[PDB]
Design a protein around this ligand. Sequence first.
Ligand SMILES: CS(=O)(=O)N1CCN([C@@H](CC2CCCCC2)C(=O)Nc2nccs2)C(=O)C1
Ligand SMILES: OC[C@H]1O[C@H](O)[C@H](O)[C@@H](O)[C@@H]1O
Length: 418
Amino acid sequence: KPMPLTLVEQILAEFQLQEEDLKKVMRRMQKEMDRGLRLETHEEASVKMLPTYVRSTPEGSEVGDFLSLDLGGTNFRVMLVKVGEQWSVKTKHQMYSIPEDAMTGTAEMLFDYISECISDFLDKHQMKHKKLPLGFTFNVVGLLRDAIKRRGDFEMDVVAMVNDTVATMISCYYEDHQCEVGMIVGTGCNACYMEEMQNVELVEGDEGRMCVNTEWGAFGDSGELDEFLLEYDRLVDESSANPGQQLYEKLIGGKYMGELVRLVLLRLVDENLLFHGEASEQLRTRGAFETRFVSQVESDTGDRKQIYNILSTLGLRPSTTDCDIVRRACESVSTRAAHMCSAGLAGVINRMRESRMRITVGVDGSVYKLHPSFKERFHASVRRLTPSCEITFIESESGRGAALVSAVACKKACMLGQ
Ligand SMILES: CS(=O)(=O)N1CCN([C@@H](CC2CCCCC2)C(=O)Nc2nccs2)C(=O)C1
Ligand SMILES: OC[C@H]1O[C@H](O)[C@H](O)[C@@H](O)[C@@H]1O
């Protein structure tokens, strides 16, 4: 690395977060999860800790057979699943490519094509009498119900989807049975984990555990993060659709990460430390610096070409120094996102530890998967904040994890009386 520009470093250093800071954030998250878990304070609690009814014991034994529907980009998978016995997950499936016609009509006309494919599948395997439960993997539930009803020839119960943190936990559990935490760092950020039943005051029972959906994005309503906010965070918060809300997520989520960078670049520019104090009209446009650009700038192999090309797309003609500064502005934001995020997962893992540590954590999300070194910085920060825990991280990815998600969602549904 070259000797950095001092003036720039003083501005980017404002993003730094010390251990003592993250422990502050951690402890504040912890008290907020306590408020969420308890009957008495749950309604005013901003971190809701939603019981998911996904228990540590297999329930809904009378659901052995079901249909799993993995809805993807340009196609979908229909999959028949039979659960037996550890659970014996038997599957057969079919890939269906969505025609361009079906893609480009309306959402209702789309799900009629999906329903049509389901009919063919059931005919192919002689199951059009069986009235199977159907889960979704990746209001489409509503659309499929209406599209099946519209057909009338076969009957089918489309169950409620699980939260994406829960699906991540369940599909990662398939491959590593030590997984008891699900986490998403994409557009938004959330976490779920297996809580002790005695702590889940909203569902009575002492025995076993239940997944709890933290919905921790809402953390910060009472100013729990105020001392750690910066002018740019405040600006993002004011221009957003929901000012004063989702403050924790605003620091971390992919939804705003690009906008934060853009604002940092404008500060630098206005300080005459970047682009000779001259921004483009694109750069002065809200939303122009896409979050994908951040990962791209931080992927640059050292030759400045991915950075140059991105900045050129915004109507800038950057010097080599300008490209270095952008990289460092991107890293500041990323690394701060990773810190803030690690403080949340640390509060969860330390809370789980008190009740008892080798533990696996399932993770998903574009930021965690695709941002060059978010995961690395994130891992190291959590491990630091969680002494006496050994944390294995895995990413969700033959379609049997998805089948296990759909089995749980259907069995949950049976258990709750539909
Ligand atoms: C027999 S098994 O080894 O295949 N197996 C997987 C399923 N589960 C949990 C879900 C898991 C989800 C991940 C964390 C631990 C519970 C489970 O099925 N929970 C349910 N809650 C409501 C309906 S079903 C089990 O208890 C054990
Ligand atoms: O998609 C990740 C997360 O984004 C948002 O925070 C949603 O509120 C939450 O339900 C979801 O788990």
